[PDB]
Amino acid sequence: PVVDTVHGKVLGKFVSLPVAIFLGIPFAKPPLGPLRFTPPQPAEPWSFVKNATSYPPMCTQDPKAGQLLSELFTNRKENIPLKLSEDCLYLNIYTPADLTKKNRLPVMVWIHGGGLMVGAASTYDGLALAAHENVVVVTIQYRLGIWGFFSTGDEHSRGNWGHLDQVAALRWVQDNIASFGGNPGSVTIFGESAGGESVSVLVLSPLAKNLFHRAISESGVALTSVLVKKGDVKPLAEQIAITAGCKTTTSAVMVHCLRQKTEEELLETTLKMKFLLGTVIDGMLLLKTPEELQAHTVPYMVGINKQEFGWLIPMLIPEATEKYLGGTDDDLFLDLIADVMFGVPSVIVARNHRDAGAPTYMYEFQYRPSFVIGDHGDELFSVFGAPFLASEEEIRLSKMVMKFWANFARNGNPNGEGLPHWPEYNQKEGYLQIGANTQAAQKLKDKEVAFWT
Amino acid sequence: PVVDTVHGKVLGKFVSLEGFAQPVAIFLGIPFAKPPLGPLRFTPPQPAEPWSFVKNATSYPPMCTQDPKAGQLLSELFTNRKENIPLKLSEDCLYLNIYTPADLTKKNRLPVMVWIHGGGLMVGAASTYDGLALAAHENVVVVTIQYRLGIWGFFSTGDEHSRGNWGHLDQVAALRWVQDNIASFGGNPGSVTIFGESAGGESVSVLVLSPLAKNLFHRAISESGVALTSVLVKKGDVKPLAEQIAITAGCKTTTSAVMVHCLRQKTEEELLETTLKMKFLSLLGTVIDGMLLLKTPEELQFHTVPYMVGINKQEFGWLIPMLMSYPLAMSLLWKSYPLVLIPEATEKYLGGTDDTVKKKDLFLDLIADVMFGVPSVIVARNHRDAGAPTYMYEFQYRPSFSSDMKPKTVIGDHGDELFSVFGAPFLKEGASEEEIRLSKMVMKFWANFARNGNPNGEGLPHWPEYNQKEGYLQIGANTQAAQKLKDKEVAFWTNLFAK
Amino acid sequence: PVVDTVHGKVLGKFVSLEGFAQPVAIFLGIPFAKPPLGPLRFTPPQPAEPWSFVKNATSYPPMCTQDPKAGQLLSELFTNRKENIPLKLSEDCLYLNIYTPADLTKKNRLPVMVWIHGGGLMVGAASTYDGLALAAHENVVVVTIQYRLGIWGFFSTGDEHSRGNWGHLDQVAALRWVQDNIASFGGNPGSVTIFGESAGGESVSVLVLSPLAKNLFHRAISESGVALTSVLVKKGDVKPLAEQIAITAGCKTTTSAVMVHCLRQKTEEELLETTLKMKFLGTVIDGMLLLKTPEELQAERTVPYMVGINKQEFGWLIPMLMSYPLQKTAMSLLWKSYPLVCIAKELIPEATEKYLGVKKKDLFLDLIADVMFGVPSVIVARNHRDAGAPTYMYEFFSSDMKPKTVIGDHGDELFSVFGAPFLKEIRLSKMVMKFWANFARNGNPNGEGLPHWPEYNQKEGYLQIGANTQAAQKLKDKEVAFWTN
Ligand SMILES: *[P@@](C)(=O)OC1CCCCC1
Ligand SMILES: *[P@@](C)(=O)OC1CCCCC1
Numbered sequence A: 001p002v003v004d005t006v007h008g009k010v011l012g013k014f015v016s017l018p019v020a021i022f023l024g025i026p027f028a029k030p031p032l033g034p035l036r037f038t039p040p041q042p043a044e045p046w047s048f049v050k051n052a053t054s055y056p057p058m059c060t061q062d063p064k065a066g067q068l069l070s071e072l073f074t075n076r077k078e079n080i081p082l083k084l085s086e087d088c089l090y091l092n093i094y095t096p097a098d099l100t101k102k103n104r105l106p107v108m109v110w111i112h113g114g115g116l117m118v119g120a121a122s123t124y125d126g127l128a129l130a131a132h133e134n135v136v137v138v139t140i141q142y143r144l145g146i147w148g149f150f151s152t153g154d155e156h157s158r159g160n161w162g163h164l165d166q167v168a169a170l171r172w173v174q175d176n177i178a179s180f181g182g183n184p185g186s187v188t189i190f191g192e193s194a195g196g197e198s199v200s201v202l203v204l205s206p207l208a209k210n211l212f213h214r215a216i217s218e219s220g221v222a223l224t225s226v227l228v229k230k231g232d233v234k235p236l237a238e239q240i241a242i243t244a245g246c247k248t249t250t251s252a253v254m255v256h257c258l259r260q261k262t263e264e265e266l267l268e269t270t271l272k273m274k275f276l277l278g279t280v281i282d283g284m285l286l287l288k289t290p291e292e293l294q295a296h297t298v299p300y301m302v303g304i305n306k307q308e309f310g311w312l313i314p315m316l317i318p319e320a321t322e323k324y325l326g327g328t329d330d331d332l333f334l335d336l337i338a339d340v341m342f343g344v345p346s347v348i349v350a351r352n353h354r355d356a357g358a359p360t361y362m363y364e365f366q367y368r369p370s371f372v373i374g375d376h377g378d379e380l381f382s383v384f385g386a387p388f389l390a391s392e393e394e395i396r397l398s399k400m401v402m403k404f405w406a407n408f409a410r411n412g413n414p415n416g417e418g419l420p421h422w423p424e425y426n427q428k429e430g431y432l433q434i435g436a437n438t439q440a441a442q443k444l445k446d447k448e449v450a451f452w453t
Numbered sequence B: 001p002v003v004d005t006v007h008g009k010v011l012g013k014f015v016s017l018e019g020f021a022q023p024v025a026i027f028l029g030i031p032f033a034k035p036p037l038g039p040l041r042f043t044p045p046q047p048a049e050p051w052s053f054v055k056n057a058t059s060y061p062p063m064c065t066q067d068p069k070a071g072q073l074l075s076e077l078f079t080n081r082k083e084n085i086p087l088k089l090s091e092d093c094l095y096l097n098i099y100t101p102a103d104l105t106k107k108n109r110l111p112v113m114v115w116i117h118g119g120g121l122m123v124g125a126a127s128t129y130d131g132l133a134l135a136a137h138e139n140v141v142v143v144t145i146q147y148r149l150g151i152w153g154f155f156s157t158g159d160e161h162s163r164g165n166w167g168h169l170d171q172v173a174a175l176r177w178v179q180d181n182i183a184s185f186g187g188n189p190g191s192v193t194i195f196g197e198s199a200g201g202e203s204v205s206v207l208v209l210s211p212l213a214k215n216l217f218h219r220a221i222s223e224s225g226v227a228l229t230s231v232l233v234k235k236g237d238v239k240p241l242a243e244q245i246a247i248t249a250g251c252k253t254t255t256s257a258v259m260v261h262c263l264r265q266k267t268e269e270e271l272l273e274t275t276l277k278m279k280f281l282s283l284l285g286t287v288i289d290g291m292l293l294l295k296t297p298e299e300l301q302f303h304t305v306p307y308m309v310g311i312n313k314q315e316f317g318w319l320i321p322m323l324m325s326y327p328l329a330m331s332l333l334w335k336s337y338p339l340v341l342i343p344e345a346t347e348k349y350l351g352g353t354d355d356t357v358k359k360k361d362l363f364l365d366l367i368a369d370v371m372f373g374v375p376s377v378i379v380a381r382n383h384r385d386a387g388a389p390t391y392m393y394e395f396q397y398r399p400s401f402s403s404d405m406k407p408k409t410v411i412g413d414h415g416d417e418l419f420s421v422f423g424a425p426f427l428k429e430g431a432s433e434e435e436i437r438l439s440k441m442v443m444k445f446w447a448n449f450a451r452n453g454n455p456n457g458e459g460l461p462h463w464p465e466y467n468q469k470e471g472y473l474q475i476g477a478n479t480q481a482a483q484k485l486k487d488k489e490v491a492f493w494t495n496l497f498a499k
Numbered sequence C: 001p002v003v004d005t006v007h008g009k010v011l012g013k014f015v016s017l018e019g020f021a022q023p024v025a026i027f028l029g030i031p032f033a034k035p036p037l038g039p040l041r042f043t044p045p046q047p048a049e050p051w052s053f054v055k056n057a058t059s060y061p062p063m064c065t066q067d068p069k070a071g072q073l074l075s076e077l078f079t080n081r082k083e084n085i086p087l088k089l090s091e092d093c094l095y096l097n098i099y100t101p102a103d104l105t106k107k108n109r110l111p112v113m114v115w116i117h118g119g120g121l122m123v124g125a126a127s128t129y130d131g132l133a134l135a136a137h138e139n140v141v142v143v144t145i146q147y148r149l150g151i152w153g154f155f156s157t158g159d160e161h162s163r164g165n166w167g168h169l170d171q172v173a174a175l176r177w178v179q180d181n182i183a184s185f186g187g188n189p190g191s192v193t194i195f196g197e198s199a200g201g202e203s204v205s206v207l208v209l210s211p212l213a214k215n216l217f218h219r220a221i222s223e224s225g226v227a228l229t230s231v232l233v234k235k236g237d238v239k240p241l242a243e244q245i246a247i248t249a250g251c252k253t254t255t256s257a258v259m260v261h262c263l264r265q266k267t268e269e270e271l272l273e274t275t276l277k278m279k280f281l282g283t284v285i286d287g288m289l290l291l292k293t294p295e296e297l298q299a300e301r302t303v304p305y306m307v308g309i310n311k312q313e314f315g316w317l318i319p320m321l322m323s324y325p326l327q328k329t330a331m332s333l334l335w336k337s338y339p340l341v342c343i344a345k346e347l348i349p350e351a352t353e354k355y356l357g358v359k360k361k362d363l364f365l366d367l368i369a370d371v372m373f374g375v376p377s378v379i380v381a382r383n384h385r386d387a388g389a390p391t392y393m394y395e396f397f398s399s400d401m402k403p404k405t406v407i408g409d410h411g412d413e414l415f416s417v418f419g420a421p422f423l424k425e426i427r428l429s430k431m432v433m434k435f436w437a438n439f440a441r442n443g444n445p446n447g448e449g450l451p452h453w454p455e456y457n458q459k460e461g462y463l464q465i466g467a468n469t470q471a472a473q474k475l476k477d478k479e480v481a482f483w484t485n
């Protein structure tokens, strides 16, 4: 299959579950040399046909931690080994459309997670979802760690370099997606963990206006303080510069020095830092804090998993400790951490969104995939049809979820034939409990919110 | 205090000067250009990137890379603050400081006085000069700007690969930042005066001759230094100086373009060691680039704006000779070639006296006249002759804030007028009531001129205009008019140099 | 002499050639582009920054980075000056030299002949060739241009991160500088002829096939070298060559963009050591300069074109430089010569046999000769002739080490074209210069006092230049047939 984009022709391959898969398409200019720590640039056009049949590179991050996460979230039988590089602003496309005719299938752009430190788009295979629910799946990449989030707190390096790629990727879709059978007028963004935090931010950013029409934050929102550095970040910048062997005489000086370091050097700095940097109020992408901003009204689904701090994350005061551990002398602490990190934040968000006047849907995933219940990221295997790349029970669960996510992708409403009714998160605070028994329920984490608030 | 500029908001601080109801708003370190780092080195200044939110402007900016010892020494000798301020060194130095007496909570169009420090185009910093006193006393907005120095601001290849005058272009860029933003600090962009001393006067002189500075200012004051002061203006083929610098720095000199690329990769620290090896200021500069200056200052002799031009009684009395590590006639005179027939001259200034002690002072007067005396007047005359207002002065006074090592017989030494202009008697301690008054007088003159293009006003001895009567002012303990300054010497020097 | 160009004034010098009243004005080292340094490396040429006052261009410009030994050796063997000139090496080399016989104190529209040196797209310099003689004798403006070589002018990744042909783009940029400025030197921008030998002919051939060179010239002369000479045109996936070069230089090959960024940071000295280690890149189908292969382009169809070769192309010069190892053995070497003839291992016997079935050694040299220049040149001349444009064919101070039995060796025609007999036979040169010059003005070599030079039409009439310059027919006809089969 050969599609014709704005920057040139790209050659893909057919895969039958047939679908046309285009791996590694550049949506920006390689952020190398002096382009580092700067907004993404449009991509230079190419003559002839661009062969897009091999996976693009993860983006520079810890190679061990990244390969481990890829291995734990991937919905492919065999995990794929990625290369590391600063040249990583690529996206993958999975289209079920029959390119030999016009097609306006809805579009679902996925934003991977990884604490804004690790991850890759190639981890998630959208062959299943595309084929099953007849939508165009796009997995994008953005800069991570130092490379995509270094900030000085001033005009010499505002920050959010990573969030700007996400926007640039979204804009590449508006201008080119129709050539793959997708309707640029019906675009949905969704991601989990740091990926949900990103979906949440783009919904709050003026720059992302008109680039999408629906959103899905899976286990993660903007209020999840961990990923949003509020206050003076200058001190974090100065430490990073020092650890890397730079002077901190001034901001401008710190950035110039860092632009000369080699990728390998900046990775050793990253390693020394022993993380595991983040979204900041830069003045361009975010003008005020997520809180102040909650003081685009597009359909927004927000969900969490039963046990967020059950195993995956942990593995990789008195009043509170008491409030969760008092009633038993004999997991409750893991529920504490869970509620503070996703539980409470998610609902307070869903409520504000609901209150600003836009459609809102909540869900609580609860199921132990075959590939602790409702652990971090467990919903991922259902959304991406892992059971097709499994007890007959699981196969069905995936089918149900994909249909929900897909329906929403086209109507801004998850409901449809053969699917338990999913109430809208209105005043009745009606949400969905997804699992072996998917039934409606009400007032999710209500009590805790009150407590923590 | 929070002012709103074109590039964003800046936050300053209020400072009250003894005996004044309206405190002053001080904004330290405001960027008027983009940090000339990396590939921006040896290139014109770029506009400054705008910033979101409010920019805290409450700490002194750093100083353009220069010799840290020599710079801190000069800062200590010219500073009008009680305590001298220790500066950091950096290529990121294109900043300016603002001192405004205006009450920002209302409209204000106070005249503006932009100061251009001196330092032989090799050392110096804006933070040395505190404009709290002048601003408060004469009700004007004082601005102290910075520009690139030494290699960083004057390296030239003599061709389009590095014309030069990078430093003089920042001065223009700083002047343009004022036009576009000064009104937000209570200043009238329509009444801007530039003034500086030594290399700073040489700069004021150049800007008055440069087509690029047209409309950026309306008055000028050159304190002890003009464009004709050959020492700072490299005339002729500069290519050889460029090649030496490149070599000393470990670069090939295959071509111009190659020399500049090589130099752009050197680290600031390396270029400073090159500077140090060069041993300048011990016994690079404005060049005719084609953009800032199209022909020599002589050939050019321009904006007919008012100009004051003055010198000090003993320019070579102690400060300069000392710093350069002067060896203290025909022998030295010749050895002084990089700063300034010999027998005729040595004779003309040392003949009438056998006393070799006196004869020594007479040699210092020679160097003085050649470096400032004669040049200044020949300039004032041309300016006068092109049809614009011209005022001359000769400062003569030994400030109390002078150095301990400075012989007491020295009066009107290099830069001595600085303490009067910047109200040193109101920031430092222990000033005879005589000095306090001298400062008051000078500030009122400099300020009056800053608004009318005429120094005169109530309670001030009459300052004649430098017309055909060559009337000038003698500033000191007894400030009275006099005539035909250095007339005789000019004639002499103008002649010996003829052949 | 002071001429006034678009980017500023340039100052030259007058030089008189023995027996001429009008001395010539020589302008050495004029920039036609911006020094391709730093981030400008591996990118198209940029216009040149304008200078103020008067530029002092009276000294030879540097030579594009290349092997200093091999380059100085070639300069010494082709140069038409009494004494050879020592050049400096630099990436800052996008310059041109001008030799004008015109009397600048009046209007003049003399034809223009732009020379493109050879050197396998690896070595060479414009300063090697002195155009004082040709200019003065045939009254034309001679221009010797320079372009990037080796890695610097031909590195390619096969994609939009470094298409390639950086060197061929300078040639175009040089040609465009002539259009905009040549008239200030007494030249008519409407009558421009390009000519070069070896890799220089290959370049002239490419510019004639490139849409970008349209309207920049009106005549062409390829001396011993055309586009079909496969050795200089990398067809197919070049990515592997790029990855090797990056590795040899100490770069990662994670992606194309990454290879180019890495290489842009290497110092000129480093990239030269990489070049040296390689122990030798070339014209590629980039999509900008060349859209399809030279073959495909000649399938589809027009300025006059002269195409010629020399009697013994592989007689001494090339075999020597490459350090050549000199019926059974023939097939051995032939195969080992794959990077120069790209002949299939199976075919070899047929060929080795066809030419060899001491003397046999000369016959092998004729083989290599025919495959490299002979056959290619004619197949070209024919296509050009068949597309409907004028076509002319021809068959044309040596080294002490050069065996005396060698005649019409590689580049031997150079001394005639550039009037070597007037700086360091005398008649031969005169004849050639008049031909090359006539063509430069009419698109026809013929004129008074010159043996008739037939046009390469269906009669395949060509010229045999030498001690006895007479017409002949069907050049290399038989061989073409053989090889084509
Ligand atoms: P999301 C799955 O990206 O959050 C991460 C942060 C690093 C530790 C594990 C969870
Ligand atoms: P002017 C003070 O700028 O020139 C001289 C002053 C004394 C040190 C050397 C430069």
Ligand SMILES: *[P@@](C)(=O)OC1CCCCC1
Pocket (backbone or CB within 6 Å): C074, C118, C119, C120, C121, C123, C197, C198, C199, C200, C317, C318, C321, C322
């Ligand atoms: P042609 C003159 O372009 O190629 C030559 C270069 C020197 C070695 C043999 C081939």
